[PDB]
């Protein structure tokens, strides 16, 4: 690993998300967020396709997110310097799991992810200061939920944590309670892999 | 039913006190007095397992949290701590002692695998010292370079913390993947302390 003198002291950050923001802060990275315009439809970019497996979809996904971010930079006339994105998504025998419309939904997601393993894959990208795709980056990791009880996650979706994430629980947050391991990446799983983030970042010679 | 609305963490550790935190439990300390010498109840035994020495050191630690209720004069509630030790190749690796040490305890672990070890401990509110937990983790660091590990010294990241590097941090740069608790290497294994902490009866 040749990590060449970096010539970028801020990154731009093409995420609205809290999560990847304390990530990138916990790595030393500085950042200007750098989020879709009023007319840009952001959320068009995130849907899926027939058959597509999970990881097929995160990367593609990733990499319009990527595209409509260097595109976004090209029309501020801001200055130029690399640009990073990411995607998440959270999935068991396959099916990919959105955020619960309510208790029931929280309540029959956990019930799911209850006693067993799930996976979640996060991508990320990076476009350099010229223009360039970098070779997107996988993290893959497996959560294991505890059987626990019935009673145990309504008492969890009662505290309201569930809602608006993913798969129904946050893994920073009280969930923590309920799960016995994981394998992979922690930063991964919250949004963004640090350990592939920071070598696309040197690559893109950000300095940090 | 949940009885206490409160605990005691004798811990001066901020990773530790973040950790119980984000399970909603709400907490008091009890810290050493100055003139309480903390730092040898984590003394080594010669020979001793690392698996071992945690437990060992994390029952001291209870009685020895137990004594400053007693001492501090403070109502009854239960009582949290924790002890942390990274291991390889059998030997143990506490906090390192300065630079040196730190960047020869980077260079041993690069490019290997090696294990985290948080035992964690609950009195509860009766005074009864409830059976101690361990949780395992392993971690695996990239051969990066002798260079990135000086950098990261540097950084002084590494001071406080067994083995020298801190997950939370810039030392997530290296590390290559986990498997275990990402809360149980930083100090507190939120799986095993929430489950002692529903035993004790503690609201959150």
Redesign the interface.
């Known amino acids: ?1 040749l ?1 060449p003198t970096p010539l970028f002291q801020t990154l731009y950050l093409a995420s609205q998300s809290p999560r990847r923001q304390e990530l990138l802060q ?3 990275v500085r950042f200007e967020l750098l989020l879709p315009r009023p007319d840009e439809d952001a959320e068009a970019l995130e849907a899926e396709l027939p058959g597509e497996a999970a990881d097929a979809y995160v990367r593609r996904v990733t990499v319009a997110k990527a595209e409509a971010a260097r595109a976004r930079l090209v029309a501020s006339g801001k200055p130029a310097a690399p640009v990073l994105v990411a995607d998440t998504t959270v999935t068991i025998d396959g099916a990919i799991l959105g955020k619960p419309t309510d208790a029931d939904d929280a309540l029959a997601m956990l019930t799911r992810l209850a006693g067993r393993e799930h996976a979640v894959l996060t991508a990320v990208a990076v476009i350099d200061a010229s223009g360039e795709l970098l070779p997107p980056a996988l993290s893959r990791s497996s959560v294991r939920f ?1 059987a626990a009880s019935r009673d145990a996650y309504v008492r969890y979706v009662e ?1 309201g944590e569930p809602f608006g994430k993913a798969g129904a629980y946050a893994i ?3 969930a ?12 991964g799983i919250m949004g963004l892999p ?2 592939e983030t ?1 070598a696309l970042l040197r690559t893109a010679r950000v300095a940090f």
Not at 176 to 187: T, V, Y
């Open positions: 690993a990590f916990q790595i030393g505890a505290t920073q947050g009280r923590a309670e309920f799960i016995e391991r994981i394998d992979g990446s922690h930063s640090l350990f920071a």
